[PDB]
């Protein structure tokens, strides 16, 4: 009577069809059954990493006892699962909880071999009294049956520490599945998610969601990882199955927003962007109608959009908009890095490759060191590459290895071993890529680093993933590693390579991509830097209505008297502020150069006055 | 009825316009509605560096529910924000806390899913024991109680990721900070509220 | 004055964090007009190297400065006994109304390769971890002080590598993982190289 | 005088919540003043529960909480727990010079004549 | 003797508050004396910290005595307290003072040994 009060009944819910089929895993079912039919010590315990399915094995056993495919002495047993939550409730008196436990064990004693007790997550029993000890004469007499299932590390922390009980437990390792069997599991679960929603599921989704979740999402285990993408793509489609779709929604909300702001200001400007956005939203709307005039199930693309929206990693089917980007990408990237066309054509050649699905599955997608003399653009290039992959330039993960000059400073990027001072804190590299890995990593001046950090970057490359002093393996399999230097600094093309072979080990140069070598600058390719500096200067002081008028003789004169092919384009950026900035900075706070003015510059034989 | 005594009610405060207007961020609202309406394991967690707006998303969800822009099976489901500070008020004896928590869970499950619970700063849910905070573990994975949370990014890996049995039953929804261009729109939106409190 | 405007925002961001970023509202432009001649009451001569130090202050208070660079990072050297330390304590006199509120570190002691750690901190797991650096935790409190570097010759060429991202970026790190910004301090470097070159 | 004797499980938490409900109950009168507020962090050593109980109350501005901690006992405790760090504004009090310290000394020259009749 | 029985929360704190309240309960005639006070910094588990407002307000007189080697390792690293103490320095004496002191203690050992 008390088991009816406190505990539960799987067999009650088993006869009502209130579970799901456990198609698969015959071996562990037969193992647990055969251990349970022993004369003595029939206490099985399932131990395995979480999420592989351990409750589902006991549910399949309950289904099989209801059906009757079991061997001999397992007819009509009605497996009862206890409820340790309700055991401790309102028992605020002295000798009450042990008497409730004694009443339940007395209710277990009378029936001979029917009831199979099933305590789930049995590592709570070690405490939970102040009690919880009245098991030893019970298991010393074979009455209790005690099927259970804990997780992997939580077993050895409590129970093996408290080893007086573990001799009365036979163990079973639960094995995780692979990619092949997960598809056969997902075929047996399609028939329920069709019923819970108003959707149908193509088997292409059941192929692609099992394949695509193996590479990208690396935190979980296979059986329940694959259910998530299907079960949430169904919800996304059910959102779109309702009356009006997406995008159009995006644009409607956006134009309503800009409308709000604009009318509140009543800026022009936005007035234009309103109109343009109204043109677009019009076009799409018409297109929508057209299509209608001319989907109700999940396809391949919905799994791709779920895995793209979550975890930040873009992986779709090249949805018609980035084809405008990835072919124009050279000219669009050459708006901030002038010259170095042979280098842009090789940096661009590692994004179009890995975007189009031809690249290697265990490799960082870009890993290439580029070097030469100074003032060329080898630092400006990375902050120009990360200007349209992210559409903002402050979203770069940048470390500087000009500070790691000695041996022990590895630990500010790999974390301390556990049990030390900094273990709350963690590393600065490991715990900044595990949070949404897609970013671009830099290494400013890899030369002056100590030559033992490099034996950490050997398994950053060539494997894809690294360990830390905490117990995780974060993977860099889809980042873009970039290394900079100034090595050689005077070699034509080969003394640089001799210096690189002298300083780096050959088994580190072997693992890279094409080591680029930059060339410098040219007199004609300097004027295009000059007018970019001047337009950036105008954009800086665009806040006081103070535009400029530079005549082409003055812009020509800026190219000449700061030129030298030994410091790059750095002296020009000082010469601009030595010519303009002195006189402008003095006169601007001296009155008379007030707002709403287009001040010119004119050529003088030494300066250029205002 | 027991949730009257250990909870606030954000929907009841939203129904008199006592919440600051939430402007921006359609993507995170659509993502929360997508995750919260699946079949099993339906409980997201908002995660981001602090100050970027994570309470603002849940208040925007409450505004959008009371307005009614949601799909069909999300309409008129009040968001009852729970507590764990007020629940361990009188808890001296050996069984009162677990009784109180089981009363709360029974009162939630007794409904038909009409309630969306909201534990803000759920990195305190591990403790309060002495076991406790472990009897909620079977209820999460079955899919009954809908739970929305908000942690900082660096208390998460200290209090929750240590306890890997729990964190499998969540859905991490990352929230990143905006740029300047959206902040100008946010500041144009919230301009009217401070002009009324300070008469300027 | 019956509504807020773009000036009081600058007043708030001045009075908090201590950085003077206003408009020079008619009072202290009278000071910065006379700075090549006000500074001459304590330094005599050296006229071509006061008209440049007196220029990285005026162009940084007009708003023409490069917003990701220190406002002035220049190195002056020469023979001994000239006034190259007296100048760098005299331009810290009218900016601060004192002469002891500057970050005066001395790199005459960093002969070996492992005194980096006293100005950059220590990586976690080691003995003095919660101490920061000596260069780092004197800026993060008030990010406006002028910084000296006395006799940079004697440092081993490893300290220059630490100093290399101070210039032209403005940020460095420490053990705790914070990027302290040197975007609006005036770095000053002294030396005595050659001391009589033609 | 609030963690005074609290060896029972819920004894501290209802005490603190009673103090906070009394502060919240009155009509915006009471401005609290906690001195040495770095002791907020390690309040109830149970598993962090106490100290960050008042975190959903400071964001709405319900208790005005003027505090005073030193410079170097701040980036050891409060910067460690940066969810609290953005609730607090900061006022930087630097030392004066001699030119005003003379004026500060000249006004306190009355209480020392009382306690020592000289 | 004040951390004798404590494996709890708030056990040491009440035991300390009763002593401070019995001090300031009385009037000013309970000059205290903590010898070897370098064990006042730790003993937390936050403790040794109810005493900081009481020091710089003039309540307990607190003659202390630390050795110089243990001082700069345990107190000067924790500089909130070092402005709550005046540092009376005791240097070692010379020879003739020690001869006077040894003439002082000639009486006692003759009682302790009949020589």
């Amino acid at each position: 009577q008390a088991l009816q009060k406190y505990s539960t009944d799987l067999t009650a819910r088993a006869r009502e069809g209130k579970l799901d089929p456990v198609i698969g895993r015959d071996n562990e079912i037969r193992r647990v059954v055969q251990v349970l039919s022993r004369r003595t010590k029939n206490n099985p315990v399932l131990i395995g990493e979480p999420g592989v399915g351990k409750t589902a094995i006991v549910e399949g056993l309950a289904q099989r006892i209801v059906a009757g495919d079991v061997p001999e002495s397992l007819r009509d047993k009605t497996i009862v699962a206890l409820d340790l939550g309700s055991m401790v409730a309102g028992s605020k008196y002295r000798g009450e909880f042990e008497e409730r436990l004694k009443a339940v064990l007395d209710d277990i004693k009378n029936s001979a071999g029917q009831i199979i007790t099933f305590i789930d997550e049995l590592h709570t029993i070690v405490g939970a009294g102040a009690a919880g000890n009245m098991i030893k004469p019970m298991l010393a007499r074979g009455e209790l049956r005690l099927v259970g299932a804990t997780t992997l590390d939580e077993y050895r922390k409590h129970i093996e520490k408290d080893a007086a009980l573990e001799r009365r437990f036979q163990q079973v390792y639960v094995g995780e599945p692979s990619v092949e069997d997960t598809i056969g599991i997902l075929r047996g679960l399609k028939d329920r998610y069709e019923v819970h929603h108003g959707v149908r599921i193509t088997d292409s989704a059941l192929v692609a969601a099992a394949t695509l979740s193996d590479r990208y999402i690396t935190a979980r285990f296979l059986p329940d990882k694959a259910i998530d993408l299907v079960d949430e793509a169904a919800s996304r489609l059910r959102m779109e199955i309702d009356s009006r779709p997406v995008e159009i929604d995006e644009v409607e909300r956006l134009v309503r927003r800009l409308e709000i702001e604009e009318m509140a200001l009543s800026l022009a400007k936005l007035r234009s962007e309103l109109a343009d956005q109204k043109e677009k939203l019009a076009e799409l709307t018409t297109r929508w109608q057209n299509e209608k005039n001319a989907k109700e199930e999940v396809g391949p693309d919905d799994i791709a959009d779920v895995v793209s929206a979550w975890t930040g990693i873009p992986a779709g089917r090249l949805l018609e908009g980035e084809t405008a980007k990835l072919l124009r990408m050279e000219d669009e990237l050459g708006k901030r890095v002038i010259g170095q066309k042979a280098a842009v054509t090789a940096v661009s050649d590692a994004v179009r490759r890995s975007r189009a699905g031809v690249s290697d599955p265990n490799r960082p997608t870009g890993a290439f060191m580029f070097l030469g003399p100074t003032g060329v653009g080898k630092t400006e290039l990375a902050k120009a590459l990360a200007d349209f992959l992210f559409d903002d330039e402050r979203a770069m993960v940048r470390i500087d290895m000009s500070e790691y000059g000695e041996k022990h400073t590895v630990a500010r990027l790999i974390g301390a071993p556990p049990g030390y001072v900094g273990y709350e804190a963690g590393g600065q590299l490991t715990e900044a890529v595990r949070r949404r890995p897609y970013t671009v990593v830099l290494f400013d001046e890899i030369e002056k680093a100590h030559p033992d950090v490099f034996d950490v970057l050997l398994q950053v490359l060539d494997e894809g993933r690294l360990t830390d002093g905490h117990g995780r393996t974060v993977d860099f399999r889809n980042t873009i590693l970039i290394l900079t230097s100034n090595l050689g600094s005077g070699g034509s093309a080969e003394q640089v390579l001799a210096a690189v072979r002298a300083t780096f080990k050959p088994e580190f140069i072997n693992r890279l991509d094409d080591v680029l070598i930059f060339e410098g600058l040219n007199p004609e390719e300097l004027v295009r830097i000059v007018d970019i500096q001047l337009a950036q200067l105008g954009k800086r002081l665009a806040q006081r209505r103070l535009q400029l008028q530079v005549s082409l003789p003055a812009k020509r004169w800026l190219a000449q008297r700061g030129f030298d092919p030994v410091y790059g384009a750095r002296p020009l950026r000082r010469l601009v502020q030595q010519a303009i900035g002195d006189q402008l900075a003095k006169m601007l706070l001296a009155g008379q150069v007030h707002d709403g003015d287009t001040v010119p510059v004119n050529v003088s034989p030494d300066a250029d006055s205002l | 009825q027991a949730l009257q005594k250990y909870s606030t009610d954000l929907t009841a405060r939203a129904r008199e316009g006592k919440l600051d207007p939430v402007i921006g961020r359609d993507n995170e609202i659509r993502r929360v509605v997508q995750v919260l309406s699946r079949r099993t394991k339906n409980n997201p967690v908002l995660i981001g560096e602090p100050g970027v707006g994570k309470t603002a998303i849940v208040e925007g969800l409450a505004q959008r529910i009371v307005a009614g822009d949601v799909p069909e099976s999300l309409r008129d489901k009040t968001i009852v924000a729970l507590d764990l500070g007020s629940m361990v008020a009188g808890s001296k004896y050996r069984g009162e806390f677990e009784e109180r928590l089981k009363a709360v869970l029974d009162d939630i499950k007794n409904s038909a899913g009409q309630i969306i619970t909201f534990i803000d700063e759920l990195h305190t849910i591990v403790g309060a024991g002495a076991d406790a905070g472990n009897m909620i573990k079977p209820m999460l994975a079955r899919g009954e109680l809908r739970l929305v949370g908000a942690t900082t990014l660096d208390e998460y890996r200290k209090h929750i990721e240590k306890d890997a049995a729990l964190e499998r039953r969540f859905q991490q929804v990352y929230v990143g900070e905006p740029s300047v261009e959206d902040t100008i729109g946010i500041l144009r939106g919230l301009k009217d509220r401070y002009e009324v409190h300070h008469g300027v | 004055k019956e509504e807020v405007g773009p000036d009081d925002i600058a007043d708030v961001v001045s009075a908090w964090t201590g950085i003077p970023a206003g408009r020079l509202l008619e009072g202290e432009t009278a000071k910065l007009l006379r700075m090549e001649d006000e500074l001459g009451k304590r330094v005599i001569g050296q006229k071509a190297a006061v008209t440049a130090v007196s220029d990285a202050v005026r162009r940084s208070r007009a708003g023409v400065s490069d917003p990701n660079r220190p406002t002035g990072a220049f190195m002056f050297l020469g023979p001994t006994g000239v006034g190259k330390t007296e100048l760098a304590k005299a331009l810290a006199d009218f900016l601060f109304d004192d002469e002891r509120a500057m970050v005066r570190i001395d790199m005459s002691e960093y002969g070996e390769k492992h005194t980096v750690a006293r100005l950059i901190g220590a990586p976690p797991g080691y003995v003095g971890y919660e101490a920061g650096g000596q260069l780092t935790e004197a800026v993060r409190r008030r990010p406006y002080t002028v910084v000296l570097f006395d006799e940079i010759e004697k440092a081993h060429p490893d300290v220059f590598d630490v100093l290399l991202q101070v210039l032209d970026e403005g940020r460095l790190t420490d053990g705790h993982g914070r990027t302290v910004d040197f975007r609006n301090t005036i770095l000053i470097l002294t030396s005595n190289l050659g001391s009589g070159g033609s | 005088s609030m963690v005074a004797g609290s060896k029972y499980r819920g004894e501290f938490e209802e005490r603190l919540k009673a103090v906070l409900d009394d502060i919240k109950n009155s009509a915006g009168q009471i401005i609290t003043f906690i001195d040495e507020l770095h002791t907020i962090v390690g309040a109830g050593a149970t598993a962090m529960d106490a100290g960050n109980m008042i975190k959903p109350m400071l964001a709405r501005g319900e208790l005005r909480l003027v505090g005073a901690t030193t410079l170097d006992e701040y980036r050891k405790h409060i910067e460690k727990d940066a969810a609290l760090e953005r609730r607090f504004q900061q006022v930087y009090v630097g030392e004066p010079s001699v030119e005003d310290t003379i004026g500060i000394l000249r006004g306190l020259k009355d209480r020392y004549e009382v306690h020592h009749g000289v | 003797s004040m951390v004798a029985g404590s494996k709890y929360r708030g056990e040491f704190e009440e035991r300390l508050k009763a002593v401070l309240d019995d001090i300031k309960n009385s009037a000013g005639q309970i000059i205290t004396f903590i010898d070897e006070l370098h064990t006042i910094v730790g003993a937390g588990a936050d403790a040794g910290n109810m005493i900081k407002p009481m020091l710089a307000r003039g309540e307990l007189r607190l003659v202390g005595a630390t050795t110089l080697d243990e001082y700069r390792k345990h107190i000067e690293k924790d500089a909130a307290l070092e402005r709550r103490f005046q540092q009376v320095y005791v240097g070692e004496p010379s020879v003739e003072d020690t001869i006077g002191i040894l003439r002082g203690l000639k009486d006692r050992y003759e009682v302790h040994h009949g020589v």
């Binding site: 008196y93 102040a130 022990h408 | 001296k92 050996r94 | 797991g125 003995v127 | 499980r9 | -």
Partner: peptide, 26 residues
């Protein structure tokens, strides 16, 4: 007719630190 009144507890175990001991390399 008395009660139980389950009391609380407090735990502590500190951390270590290492030193590097540079070598003058000649």
């Amino acid at each position: 007719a008395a009660a139980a009144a389950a009391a609380a507890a407090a735990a502590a175990a500190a951390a270590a630190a290492a030193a590097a001991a540079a070598a003058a390399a000649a």
